[PDB]
């Protein structure tokens, strides 16, 4: 992955900086690490990052709490995840189209409002690419591939990007994905684009078809010292779940149609040592069952705005964000964060950060079939502690933090409903590492994650305590190998068998992948990967064979 201190990112404040000027934990995955990593889900890529815990239908705890308190956007906006589902429908979303992945750990509601608690993960779809490039796989389980993308210069001012794929997985899940972006520039400051993209998505489970898609159109202004944005997005799908003997419009079938409009304003200005930013954001999402008619549906609807700061003074580094949304649903809550970084020598640095965010209920977990109308928001406290250095050729940082979660809702599988779990802490570790042994290339991560009820001291379930994340790369005779090692711990969860039902503790899993490339040509590369190498039942031993074709 991209360890550099040096490469911007854009999902801290909106606009870009250097990451190691954000003062949170960042990781950044680009389109060549899922390439080589040879991922055919956005779940393979997440499992790889630090404090992510992805068991496979899929399990995700993210520094202990489920994938839902991590605020998931596709290029900066909000990705509609407030389905039945919640989001459980990430996995729906096309690896085809993931050219990159920022993802920042710690709260950023202060950024971007609800359900940033515990961190950020923005998917973006663009990249600076120019050329053709043809790819196909097959694999265990029936697995098909292929893909066309081109990026096409049309005049110094305007790039158009597009792209099509083809996605099938034992009929288990077929996906078949377009996307078409216009990038350009009206003069050397003012900038516009206008992307759309949607996919089709059967899964047999009981049927499934999930038609999305997804517009968004913006303008910028990149001045010397003033940069601003302007976007808007419209996202749609329908989505029928039914049993195929009956069809689609069978008593029992569903079908779900949801909107998400955004309207987002961002500026951000370079002021002393720093910049300072402020911008204002309306978003609603909207879901309307079997008929169409929205009269029998419900929307959600929030505005909000925020302010964030960042500032060098001499050693130390100022960071900081506030944020008051409108709920319409929940009313107002504001949310702020600041942290400080003293670089005490040169190379080394303590950061300390604190910061509230929530999460409010969204249409899914308030009406749909999983949830409960009377959920109420969950609010989180953050405080954090770390310490990265530069040694000897070692990039490494650890932290230690604490999340106190009011009214934090869980899921019981048990039940199938959310349920308020009350007041949770999370006291966490976060340990990375990259570093390079002549050849080898190494990147590690270990996490520990202590869940808990605040007031009772009891284990929250499902969750495994110890995560360790190694990745070993080399290129050897212009072979290029991946070696992924991942442990996930210990974890409680209910023997439901008897009455009255045990707490249970469930062993880790050690997980082994072997992935390979050779650039047969300059043109031609051809990967292979074998996932889950000591075919460990704990979803066994998987092979995939694959070729990109640049032109």
Do not use: C
């Not at 589902?85 to 990430?90: I, N, Q, R």
């Not at 053709?132 to 993308?149: F, K, L, M, P, R």
């Not at 959600?300 to 925020?306: A, D, E, K, L, S």
């Not at 590492?433 to 202590?450: I, K, M, Q, R, W």
């Amino acid at each position: 992955q991209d360890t550099s201190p040096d490469t911007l990112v854009v999902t801290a404040n909106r606009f870009e900086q250097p990451r190691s000027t954000v003062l949170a934990p960042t990781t950044v995955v680009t389109r060549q690490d899922i390439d080589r990593w040879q991922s055919t889900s956005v779940n393979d890529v997440l499992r790889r990052l630090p404090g992510v815990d992805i068991t496979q239908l899929s399990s995700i705890f993210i520094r202990g709490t489920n994938a839902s308190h991590v605020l998931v956007l596709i290029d900066g906006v909000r990705l509609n995840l407030a389905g039945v589902s919640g989001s459980a429908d990430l996995s729906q979303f096309p690896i085809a189209l993931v050219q990159r992945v920022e993802y920042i750990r710690g709260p950023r509601s202060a950024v971007y409002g609800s359900d940033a608690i515990g961190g950020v993960v923005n998917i973006i779809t663009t990249r600076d690419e120019p050329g053709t490039e043809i790819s196909a796989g097959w694999g265990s389980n029936s697995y098909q591939n292929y893909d066309v993308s081109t990026q096409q210069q049309l005049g110094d001012k305007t790039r158009v990007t597009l792209l099509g794929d083809y996605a099938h997985t034992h009929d288990g899940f077929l996906s078949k994905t377009l996307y078409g972006a216009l990038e350009h520039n009206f003069t050397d400051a003012w900038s516009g684009f206008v992307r759309g993209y949607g996919y089709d998505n059967r899964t047999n489970y009981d049927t499934r078809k999930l038609y999305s898609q997804s517009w968004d159109a913006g303008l910028r202004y990149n001045g010397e010292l003033i940069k601003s944005q302007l976007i808007t997005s419209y996202s749609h799908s329908k989505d029928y779940n039914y049993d195929p003997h009956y069809g689609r419009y069978d008593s029992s079938a569903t079908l779900d149609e949801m909107k998400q409009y955004t309207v987002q304003w961002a500026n951000n200005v370079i002021v002393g040592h720093g910049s300072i930013g402020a911008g204002v954001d309306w978003q609603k999402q909207t879901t309307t069952p079997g008929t169409g008619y929205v009269e029998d549906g419900y929307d959600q609807r929030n505005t909000g705005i925020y302010l964030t700061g960042l500032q060098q003074v001499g050693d130390f580094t100022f960071e900081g964000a506030a944020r008051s949304d409108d709920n319409s649903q929940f009313g107002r809550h504001g949310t702020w964060q600041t942290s400080a970084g003293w670089e005490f020598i040169e190379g080394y640095r303590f950061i300390a950060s604190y910061g509230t965010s929530y999460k409010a209920p969204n249409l899914g977990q308030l009406y749909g079939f999983y949830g409960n109308p009377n959920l109420d928001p969950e609010k989180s406290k953050q405080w954090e502690g770390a310490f990265e250095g530069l040694t000897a050729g070692v990039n490494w940082r650890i932290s230690g933090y604490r999340n106190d979660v009011s009214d934090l809702i869980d899921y019981d599988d048990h039940t199938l409903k959310y349920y308020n779990e009350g007041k949770a802490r999370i006291k966490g570790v976060e340990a990375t590492a990259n570093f390079d042994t002549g050849p080898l290339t190494h990147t590690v991560s270990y996490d520990y994650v202590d869940a808990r009820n605040a007031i009772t001291d009891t284990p929250l379930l499902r969750r495994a305590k110890q995560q360790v994340k190694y990745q070993l790369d080399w290129q050897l005779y212009d072979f290029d190998w991946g070696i992924t090692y991942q442990y996930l711990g210990t974890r409680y969860d209910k023997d439901y068998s008897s009455y009255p039902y045990q707490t249970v503790k469930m062993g880790g899993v050690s997980l082994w992948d072997l992935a390979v490339a050779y650039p047969v040509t300059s043109h031609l590369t051809v990967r292979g990967k074998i996932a889950n190498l000591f075919d460990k039942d704990y979803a066994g031993r998987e092979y995939t064979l694959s070729g990109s074709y640049t032109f």
